[PDB]
Design a protein around this ligand. Structure first.
Ligand SMILES: O=C(c1cn[nH]c1)N1CCCC1
Length: 182
């Protein structure tokens, strides 16, 4: 509808796949080469389905901060025959608050879904499903089951992936440039 949705659409059309684990179907953001991200609660194993194709997980990693606190981001390297467009230059370098964000989802259940969630707070600490979690972004939209892994963007920035909600608010794990240095 506007330049927010334009940038979100550009990310969804080239940098997302549908990831299936034993814990369900997730939006999965591809970042560069064969490297993607997913919520740690997806419980990635040795094998994952990518757009309904059986794919070996060459490597995977559940990120924690230097206080050894959950970040709820898993970085996955896929045994896939094709690279993602490199979008690392759209990742923020520091923790921040944002205005006018869009949460975008693409699954079997929720194809081509875009939600204007408005103002994003650097919330910090959240007890997420009973797990102490750091670097949480908060937005005042009543998000629901099926949106986890959803991509949170502003015009020109990919800032996080959706990892939970409480019925009134939605929560995203930050994406930082420093997670994907090579
Ligand atoms: O930490 C990383 C990573 C992030 N950006 N590049 C590589 N990985 C661990 C699982 C496979 C990739």
């Amino acid at each position: 509808m506007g330049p927010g949705f334009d940038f979100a659409q550009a990310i969804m059309k080239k940098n997302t796949v549908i990831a299936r684990t034993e814990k369900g179907e997730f939006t999965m953001l591809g970042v560069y080469d064969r490297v993607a991200v997913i919520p740690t609660h997806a419980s990635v194993g040795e094998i994952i389905y990518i757009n309904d194709v059986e794919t070996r997980v060459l490597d995977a990693c559940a990120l924690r901060d230097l206080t050894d606190t959950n970040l709820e981001i898993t970085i996955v390297k896929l045994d896939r025959n094709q690279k993602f467009r490199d979008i690392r230059h759209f990742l923020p370098r520091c923790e921040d608050d944002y205005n006018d964000a869009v949460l975008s989802v693409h699954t079997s259940k929720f194809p081509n879904m875009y939600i204007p969630v408005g103002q994003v707070t650097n919330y910090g600490f959240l007890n997420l499903g009973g797990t102490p979690t750091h670097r949480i972004l908060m937005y005042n939209f009543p998000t629901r089951a099926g949106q986890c892994g959803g991509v949170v963007t502003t015009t020109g920035k990919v800032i996080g992936i959706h990892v939970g909600g409480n019925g009134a608010q939605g929560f995203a794990a930050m994406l930082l440039h420093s997670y994907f240095t090579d």
